Design a protein around this ligand. Sequence first.
Ligand SMILES: CNC(=N)NC(=O)NC
Ligand SMILES: CNC(=N)NC(=O)NC
Ligand SMILES: [Cl-]
Length: 310
Amino acid sequence: FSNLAIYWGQGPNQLRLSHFCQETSLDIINIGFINYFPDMSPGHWPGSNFGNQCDGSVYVTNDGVVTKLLSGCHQIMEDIPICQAAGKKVLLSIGGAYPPDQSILSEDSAVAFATFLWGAFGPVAEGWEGPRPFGDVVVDGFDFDIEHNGGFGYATMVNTFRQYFNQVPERKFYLSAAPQCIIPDAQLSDAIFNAAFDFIWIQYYNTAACSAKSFIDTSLGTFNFDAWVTVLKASASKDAKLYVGLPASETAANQGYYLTPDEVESLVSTYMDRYPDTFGGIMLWEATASENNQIDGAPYADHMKDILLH
Ligand SMILES: CNC(=N)NC(=O)NC
Ligand SMILES: CNC(=N)NC(=O)NC
Ligand SMILES: [Cl-]
Protein backbone atom coordinates (compact mmCIF):
# COMPACT_ATOMS: atom_id res chain seq x y z
CA PHE A 1 0.00 0.00 0.00
CA SER A 2 1.55 3.21 -1.47
CA ASN A 3 2.81 6.40 0.07
CA LEU A 4 2.78 10.15 -0.34
CA ALA A 5 5.92 12.16 0.54
CA ILE A 6 6.07 15.96 0.58
CA TYR A 7 8.70 18.68 1.15
CA TRP A 8 7.96 21.41 3.66
CA GLY A 9 10.15 24.23 4.93
CA GLN A 10 10.82 26.32 1.82
CA GLY A 11 7.27 27.56 1.08
CA PRO A 12 6.75 31.32 0.74
CA ASN A 13 4.64 32.49 3.73
CA GLN A 14 4.29 28.79 4.63
CA LEU A 15 1.92 27.62 7.33
CA ARG A 16 3.70 25.95 10.24
CA LEU A 17 4.49 22.21 10.11
CA SER A 18 1.57 21.30 12.40
CA HIS A 19 -0.90 22.43 9.73
CA PHE A 20 0.51 19.56 7.52
CA CYS A 21 0.73 17.20 10.44
CA GLN A 22 -3.08 17.33 10.31
CA GLU A 23 -3.44 16.51 6.65
CA THR A 24 -4.20 12.73 6.93
CA SER A 25 -3.15 12.01 3.30
CA LEU A 26 0.54 12.75 4.07
CA ASP A 27 2.75 9.81 4.77
CA ILE A 28 6.25 11.33 4.88
CA ILE A 29 7.43 14.90 5.27
CA ASN A 30 10.90 15.93 4.27
CA ILE A 31 11.98 19.16 5.97
CA GLY A 32 14.39 21.38 4.06
CA PHE A 33 17.18 22.16 4.35
CA ILE A 34 20.55 21.71 5.95
CA ASN A 35 21.90 23.75 3.11
CA TYR A 36 25.40 24.68 4.41
CA PHE A 37 27.92 21.85 4.54
CA PRO A 38 30.77 21.66 7.00
CA ASP A 39 33.74 22.11 4.64
CA MET A 40 32.72 25.59 3.56
CA SER A 41 30.82 27.00 6.46
CA PRO A 42 31.83 28.72 9.76
CA GLY A 43 33.29 26.46 12.48
CA HIS A 44 32.99 23.35 10.24
CA TRP A 45 29.37 23.10 11.50
CA PRO A 46 26.60 22.60 8.98
CA GLY A 47 24.02 25.40 8.58
CA SER A 48 20.28 25.35 8.04
CA ASN A 49 17.50 27.35 6.46
CA PHE A 50 13.81 26.87 7.12
CA GLY A 51 12.14 29.95 5.55
CA ASN A 52 9.80 31.88 7.94
CA GLN A 53 10.12 29.22 10.69
CA CYS A 54 12.96 29.81 13.17
CA ASP A 55 13.62 33.45 14.34
CA GLY A 56 17.05 33.75 12.61
CA SER A 57 19.27 33.18 15.67
CA VAL A 58 22.29 31.02 14.83
CA TYR A 59 24.52 29.02 17.17
CA VAL A 60 27.84 30.48 18.19
CA THR A 61 30.35 27.77 19.10
CA ASN A 62 32.35 27.42 22.36
CA ASP A 63 35.07 29.21 20.39
CA GLY A 64 32.87 32.19 19.66
CA VAL A 65 32.56 31.34 15.94
CA VAL A 66 29.15 32.48 14.56
CA THR A 67 27.74 29.50 12.61
CA LYS A 68 24.96 29.26 9.96
CA LEU A 69 23.03 26.72 12.07
CA LEU A 70 19.69 28.14 13.20
CA SER A 71 19.19 27.92 16.95
CA GLY A 72 15.69 29.38 17.31
CA CYS A 73 13.36 26.95 15.50
CA HIS A 74 10.74 26.64 18.26
CA GLN A 75 7.75 25.92 15.98
CA ILE A 76 9.50 23.03 14.23
CA MET A 77 10.55 21.50 17.54
CA GLU A 78 6.90 21.61 18.68
CA ASP A 79 5.52 20.34 15.42
CA ILE A 80 7.70 17.40 14.42
CA PRO A 81 6.26 15.07 17.26
CA ILE A 82 2.69 15.93 16.29
CA CYS A 83 3.46 14.64 12.81
CA GLN A 84 5.09 11.62 14.30
CA ALA A 85 2.02 10.89 16.54
CA ALA A 86 -0.09 11.03 13.37
CA GLY A 87 2.07 8.15 12.17
CA LYS A 88 4.05 10.23 9.63
CA LYS A 89 7.79 9.88 9.07
CA VAL A 90 9.69 13.12 9.33
CA LEU A 91 12.97 13.24 7.54
CA LEU A 92 15.53 16.01 7.67
CA SER A 93 16.64 17.03 4.23
CA ILE A 94 20.21 17.85 3.29
CA GLY A 95 21.06 20.27 0.44
CA GLY A 96 18.26 21.74 -1.78
CA ALA A 97 18.84 24.48 -4.44
CA TYR A 98 20.39 27.39 -2.56
CA PRO A 99 23.23 28.01 -2.20
CA PRO A 100 24.74 26.28 -5.23
CA ASP A 101 28.35 26.02 -3.96
CA GLN A 102 28.29 23.31 -1.27
CA SER A 103 29.81 19.85 -1.42
CA ILE A 104 31.96 17.41 0.58
CA LEU A 105 35.75 17.60 0.21
CA SER A 106 37.12 14.47 2.03
CA GLU A 107 35.90 11.16 3.36
CA ASP A 108 36.82 12.37 6.88
CA SER A 109 34.46 15.34 6.61
CA ALA A 110 31.76 13.01 5.12
CA VAL A 111 32.01 10.92 8.30
CA ALA A 112 31.96 14.01 10.55
CA PHE A 113 28.99 15.52 8.58
CA ALA A 114 26.82 12.42 9.28
CA THR A 115 28.08 12.18 12.92
CA PHE A 116 27.16 15.81 13.50
CA LEU A 117 23.59 15.39 12.11
CA TRP A 118 23.13 12.19 14.08
CA GLY A 119 24.29 13.88 17.31
CA ALA A 120 22.28 17.05 16.63
CA PHE A 121 18.96 15.66 15.31
CA GLY A 122 19.09 11.95 16.11
CA PRO A 123 18.54 10.29 19.53
CA VAL A 124 19.76 12.17 22.60
CA ALA A 125 23.22 10.73 23.49
CA GLU A 126 25.13 10.87 26.77
CA GLY A 127 28.44 12.03 25.23
CA TRP A 128 26.92 14.48 22.74
CA GLU A 129 28.07 18.00 23.15
CA GLY A 130 26.96 20.02 20.18
CA PRO A 131 23.70 21.71 19.36
CA ARG A 132 20.23 20.20 19.63
CA PRO A 133 18.40 22.57 17.17
CA PHE A 134 15.10 20.70 17.65
CA GLY A 135 15.82 19.91 21.31
CA ASP A 136 14.66 16.43 22.37
CA VAL A 137 13.04 15.74 18.95
CA VAL A 138 14.36 12.63 17.20
CA VAL A 139 13.81 12.81 13.43
CA ASP A 140 13.01 9.57 11.61
CA GLY A 141 16.02 9.88 9.35
CA PHE A 142 17.65 11.90 6.57
CA ASP A 143 17.02 12.94 3.01
CA PHE A 144 19.75 13.63 0.44
CA ASP A 145 18.61 16.39 -1.89
CA ILE A 146 22.07 17.12 -3.38
CA GLU A 147 21.50 19.25 -6.53
CA HIS A 148 25.01 20.55 -7.35
CA ASN A 149 28.70 19.85 -7.53
CA GLY A 150 29.02 16.17 -8.04
CA GLY A 151 28.54 13.02 -6.04
CA PHE A 152 31.62 12.74 -3.80
CA GLY A 153 31.21 11.74 -0.17
CA TYR A 154 27.43 10.95 0.02
CA ALA A 155 27.71 7.11 -0.11
CA THR A 156 30.06 7.42 2.86
CA MET A 157 27.49 9.66 4.75
CA VAL A 158 24.70 7.14 4.06
CA ASN A 159 26.83 4.14 5.16
CA THR A 160 27.85 6.12 8.23
CA PHE A 161 24.20 6.89 9.22
CA ARG A 162 23.41 3.18 8.79
CA GLN A 163 26.19 2.07 11.07
CA TYR A 164 24.62 4.54 13.63
CA PHE A 165 21.06 3.32 13.05
CA ASN A 166 22.24 -0.21 13.86
CA GLN A 167 23.44 0.88 17.27
CA VAL A 168 19.78 1.64 18.01
CA PRO A 169 17.98 -1.62 17.18
CA GLU A 170 14.60 -0.93 18.86
CA ARG A 171 13.70 1.83 16.33
CA LYS A 172 13.69 1.77 12.52
CA PHE A 173 15.27 4.93 10.95
CA TYR A 174 15.22 5.89 7.24
CA LEU A 175 17.46 7.19 4.45
CA SER A 176 16.19 8.72 1.21
CA ALA A 177 17.48 10.47 -1.95
CA ALA A 178 16.00 13.02 -4.32
CA PRO A 179 17.86 12.76 -7.67
CA GLN A 180 16.88 14.40 -10.94
CA CYS A 181 16.07 12.56 -14.15
CA ILE A 182 19.24 13.06 -16.19
CA ILE A 183 21.10 9.85 -15.33
CA PRO A 184 23.52 8.89 -14.30
CA ASP A 185 22.63 11.55 -11.73
CA ALA A 186 25.85 13.55 -11.20
CA GLN A 187 25.09 14.07 -7.46
CA LEU A 188 23.50 10.81 -6.34
CA SER A 189 24.13 7.81 -8.67
CA ASP A 190 27.16 6.78 -6.70
CA ALA A 191 25.33 7.02 -3.35
CA ILE A 192 22.44 5.06 -4.86
CA PHE A 193 24.67 2.37 -6.32
CA ASN A 194 26.95 1.99 -3.33
CA ALA A 195 24.68 2.61 -0.30
CA ALA A 196 21.17 1.41 0.73
CA PHE A 197 18.43 4.10 0.67
CA ASP A 198 14.91 3.23 1.92
CA PHE A 199 13.20 5.70 -0.45
CA ILE A 200 14.20 7.42 -3.68
CA TRP A 201 11.98 10.09 -5.11
CA ILE A 202 13.11 11.01 -8.62
CA GLN A 203 12.37 14.64 -9.30
CA TYR A 204 10.38 14.44 -12.59
CA TYR A 205 10.27 18.26 -13.16
CA ASN A 206 12.73 20.96 -14.24
CA THR A 207 14.56 18.70 -16.73
CA ALA A 208 13.03 18.49 -20.18
CA ALA A 209 14.75 15.18 -21.36
CA CYS A 210 12.99 12.81 -18.96
CA SER A 211 10.17 14.73 -17.13
CA ALA A 212 6.79 13.28 -16.00
CA LYS A 213 5.08 15.58 -18.54
CA SER A 214 7.15 13.85 -21.31
CA PHE A 215 5.00 10.89 -20.33
CA ILE A 216 1.92 12.73 -21.41
CA ASP A 217 3.55 14.39 -24.39
CA THR A 218 6.17 11.97 -25.74
CA SER A 219 7.76 14.60 -27.99
CA LEU A 220 9.07 16.67 -25.03
CA GLY A 221 11.58 14.07 -23.82
CA THR A 222 11.40 10.40 -22.76
CA PHE A 223 10.01 9.43 -19.33
CA ASN A 224 12.59 7.02 -17.95
CA PHE A 225 11.20 5.32 -14.88
CA ASP A 226 11.93 1.93 -16.51
CA ALA A 227 15.65 2.63 -16.71
CA TRP A 228 15.63 3.76 -13.10
CA VAL A 229 14.05 0.43 -12.03
CA THR A 230 16.88 -1.43 -13.85
CA VAL A 231 19.58 0.66 -12.18
CA LEU A 232 18.00 0.21 -8.71
CA LYS A 233 17.84 -3.63 -9.01
CA ALA A 234 21.63 -3.82 -9.44
CA SER A 235 22.35 -1.22 -6.74
CA ALA A 236 22.92 -1.48 -2.98
CA SER A 237 19.55 0.35 -3.08
CA LYS A 238 17.77 -2.67 -4.62
CA ASP A 239 15.31 -2.78 -1.70
CA ALA A 240 14.40 0.92 -2.08
CA LYS A 241 10.90 2.03 -2.93
CA LEU A 242 10.93 4.37 -5.95
CA TYR A 243 8.60 7.34 -6.03
CA VAL A 244 7.65 9.77 -8.79
CA GLY A 245 8.46 13.34 -7.70
CA LEU A 246 6.00 16.01 -8.98
CA PRO A 247 5.34 19.73 -8.61
CA ALA A 248 2.26 20.32 -6.41
CA SER A 249 1.12 23.27 -8.54
CA GLU A 250 1.80 25.23 -11.75
CA THR A 251 4.39 27.53 -10.19
CA ALA A 252 6.16 25.06 -7.78
CA ALA A 253 8.66 24.39 -10.62
CA ASN A 254 9.40 25.89 -14.09
CA GLN A 255 6.45 26.17 -16.60
CA GLY A 256 5.15 22.95 -18.19
CA TYR A 257 6.16 20.37 -15.56
CA TYR A 258 2.98 20.42 -13.39
CA LEU A 259 0.54 17.54 -14.25
CA THR A 260 -3.19 17.72 -13.70
CA PRO A 261 -4.68 14.98 -11.47
CA ASP A 262 -5.86 13.25 -14.71
CA GLU A 263 -2.31 13.10 -16.16
CA VAL A 264 -1.03 11.98 -12.80
CA GLU A 265 -3.53 9.15 -12.77
CA SER A 266 -2.31 7.88 -16.19
CA LEU A 267 1.36 7.86 -15.21
CA VAL A 268 0.87 6.35 -11.76
CA SER A 269 -1.57 3.66 -12.79
CA THR A 270 0.89 2.35 -15.46
CA TYR A 271 3.90 2.43 -13.16
CA MET A 272 2.18 0.91 -10.14
CA ASP A 273 0.81 -1.92 -12.29
CA ARG A 274 4.16 -2.42 -14.05
CA TYR A 275 6.24 -2.37 -10.86
CA PRO A 276 4.11 -3.42 -7.89
CA ASP A 277 7.00 -4.30 -5.54
CA THR A 278 9.22 -1.32 -6.48
CA PHE A 279 6.87 1.61 -7.07
CA GLY A 280 6.50 3.58 -3.77
CA GLY A 281 4.08 6.41 -4.50
CA ILE A 282 4.31 10.15 -5.15
CA MET A 283 6.63 12.79 -3.78
CA LEU A 284 5.49 16.40 -4.01
CA TRP A 285 7.44 19.62 -4.27
CA GLU A 286 6.07 21.16 -2.09
CA ALA A 287 3.69 21.67 0.92
CA THR A 288 2.80 25.32 0.37
CA ALA A 289 2.36 24.90 -3.41
CA SER A 290 0.01 22.00 -2.59
CA GLU A 291 -1.92 24.01 0.09
CA ASN A 292 -2.39 26.89 -2.36
CA ASN A 293 -3.54 24.67 -5.24
CA GLN A 294 -7.01 23.88 -3.99
CA ILE A 295 -9.09 21.78 -6.43
CA ASP A 296 -12.81 21.38 -5.47
CA GLY A 297 -12.12 22.32 -1.78
CA ALA A 298 -9.07 20.03 -1.20
CA PRO A 299 -5.27 20.63 -1.64
CA TYR A 300 -3.38 18.93 -4.45
CA ALA A 301 -1.80 16.34 -2.16
CA ASP A 302 -5.25 15.09 -1.03
CA HIS A 303 -6.02 14.45 -4.61
CA MET A 304 -2.68 12.64 -5.07
CA LYS A 305 -3.52 10.24 -2.24
CA ASP A 306 -6.97 9.56 -3.76
CA ILE A 307 -5.26 8.67 -7.01
CA LEU A 308 -2.85 6.31 -5.22
CA LEU A 309 -5.67 4.61 -3.25
CA HIS A 310 -7.63 3.81 -6.41
C1 LIG B 1 14.46 23.92 -3.75
N1 LIG B 1 15.40 24.45 -2.74
C2 LIG B 1 15.17 25.64 -2.18
N2 LIG B 1 14.11 26.34 -2.58
N3 LIG B 1 16.04 26.11 -1.27
C3 LIG B 1 16.03 27.32 -0.59
O1 LIG B 1 15.15 28.19 -0.79
N4 LIG B 1 17.03 27.44 0.30
C4 LIG B 1 17.18 28.69 1.07
C1 LIG C 1 14.70 23.64 -7.64
N1 LIG C 1 15.04 22.47 -6.74
C2 LIG C 1 14.06 21.71 -6.27
N2 LIG C 1 12.81 21.98 -6.61
N3 LIG C 1 14.34 20.70 -5.46
C3 LIG C 1 13.44 19.80 -5.02
O1 LIG C 1 12.25 19.86 -5.37
N4 LIG C 1 13.92 18.83 -4.26
C4 LIG C 1 12.92 17.89 -3.80
CL1 LIG D 1 0.77 28.87 10.94
